[PDB]
Design a protein around this motif. Structure first.
Motif, PDB file in Angstrom:
ATOM      1  N   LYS A  64       0.824  -1.204   0.000  1.00 50.36           N
ATOM      2  CA  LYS A  64       0.000   0.000   0.000  1.00 50.36           C
ATOM      3  C   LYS A  64       0.861   1.257   0.000  1.00 50.36           C
ATOM      4  O   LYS A  64       0.560   2.227  -0.709  1.00 50.36           O
ATOM      5  CB  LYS A  64      -0.939  -0.023   1.203  1.00 50.36           C
ATOM      6  CG  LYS A  64      -2.108   0.944   1.103  1.00 50.36           C
ATOM      7  CD  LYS A  64      -3.106   0.720   2.236  1.00 50.36           C
ATOM      8  CE  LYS A  64      -3.576  -0.728   2.280  1.00 50.36           C
ATOM      9  NZ  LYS A  64      -4.637  -0.956   3.287  1.00 50.36           N
TER      10      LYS A  64
ATOM     11  N   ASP B  57      -7.864   5.214  -7.843  1.00 58.43           N
ATOM     12  CA  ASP B  57      -8.298   5.309  -6.455  1.00 58.43           C
ATOM     13  C   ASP B  57      -8.759   3.957  -5.927  1.00 58.43           C
ATOM     14  O   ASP B  57      -8.486   3.618  -4.770  1.00 58.43           O
ATOM     15  CB  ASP B  57      -9.403   6.352  -6.316  1.00 58.43           C
ATOM     16  CG  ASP B  57      -8.862   7.770  -6.287  1.00 58.43           C
ATOM     17  OD1 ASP B  57      -7.680   7.974  -6.651  1.00 58.43           O
ATOM     18  OD2 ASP B  57      -9.613   8.676  -5.875  1.00 58.43           O
ATOM     19  N   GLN B  58      -9.450   3.165  -6.758  1.00 58.42           N
ATOM     20  CA  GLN B  58      -9.890   1.838  -6.318  1.00 58.42           C
ATOM     21  C   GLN B  58      -8.713   0.965  -5.922  1.00 58.42           C
ATOM     22  O   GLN B  58      -8.817   0.156  -4.994  1.00 58.42           O
ATOM     23  CB  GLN B  58     -10.674   1.123  -7.423  1.00 58.42           C
ATOM     24  CG  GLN B  58     -12.057   1.656  -7.719  1.00 58.42           C
ATOM     25  CD  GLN B  58     -12.683   0.955  -8.914  1.00 58.42           C
ATOM     26  OE1 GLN B  58     -13.216   1.603  -9.813  1.00 58.42           O
ATOM     27  NE2 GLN B  58     -12.625  -0.371  -8.927  1.00 58.42           N
TER      28      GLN B  58
ATOM     29  N   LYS C 184      -7.440   1.461  -2.383  1.00 59.74           N
ATOM     30  CA  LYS C 184      -8.292   0.862  -1.367  1.00 59.74           C
ATOM     31  C   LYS C 184      -8.191  -0.650  -1.358  1.00 59.74           C
ATOM     32  O   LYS C 184      -8.428  -1.271  -0.313  1.00 59.74           O
ATOM     33  CB  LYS C 184      -9.744   1.297  -1.584  1.00 59.74           C
ATOM     34  CG  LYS C 184      -9.940   2.803  -1.462  1.00 59.74           C
ATOM     35  CD  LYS C 184     -11.266   3.244  -2.078  1.00 59.74           C
ATOM     36  CE  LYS C 184     -11.468   4.747  -1.956  1.00 59.74           C
ATOM     37  NZ  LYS C 184     -12.667   5.208  -2.709  1.00 59.74           N
TER      38      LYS C 184
END
Ligand SMILES: O=C1CSc2cc(C(=O)O)ccc2N1
Length: 126
Positions: free
Chosen positions: A3, A120-121, A124
């Motif tokens: 991440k 953006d997905q 997450k």
């Protein structure tokens, strides 16, 4: 983590966005010496972004993160569309074809805008 590696990759992407917009202004103003330098800078940035994205995808695969792999496969495919258009833009600049340069420039902007919800997905999903 993967991440934080994606956040680092996202920042490199935003750097290319910033340099691109500066390059667009220079092109409109006819400052070809600046454009040439910004195009070199963008090539290096896109190369770095592409490599980070591949490492992220490979890591998601090793982690078994199926959803992140799906999204990254889609995103890396779109990245290659943008990269191909970029390279055509560079060729148009070399050739002095400002009509083609304008075309590719607007295309790259639309390919990049479209890919943002997926970007953006991925953050997450990782
Ligand atoms: O990925 C891409 C690159 S070309 C493209 C062109 C156009 C257009 O000419 O309107 C729209 C969306 C597009 N999507």
């Amino acid at each position: 983590s993967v991440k934080s590696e994606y956040a680092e990759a996202a920042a490199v992407g935003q750097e290319a966005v910033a340099v691109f917009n500066t390059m667009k202004a220079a092109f409109q103003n006819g400052d070809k010496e600046a454009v040439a330098q910004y195009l070199a800078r963008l090539a290096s940035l896109y190369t770095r972004h592409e490599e980070l994205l591949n490492r992220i995808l490979e890591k998601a695969r090793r982690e078994g993160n199926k959803e992140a792999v799906t999204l990254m496969n889609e995103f890396t495919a779109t990245f290659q569309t943008g990269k191909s258009i970029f390279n055509a833009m560079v060729a148009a600049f070399k050739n002095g074809d400002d009509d083609s340069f304008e075309s590719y420039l607007q295309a790259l902007e639309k390919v990049t805008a479209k890919g943002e919800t997926l970007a953006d997905q991925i953050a997450k999903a990782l």
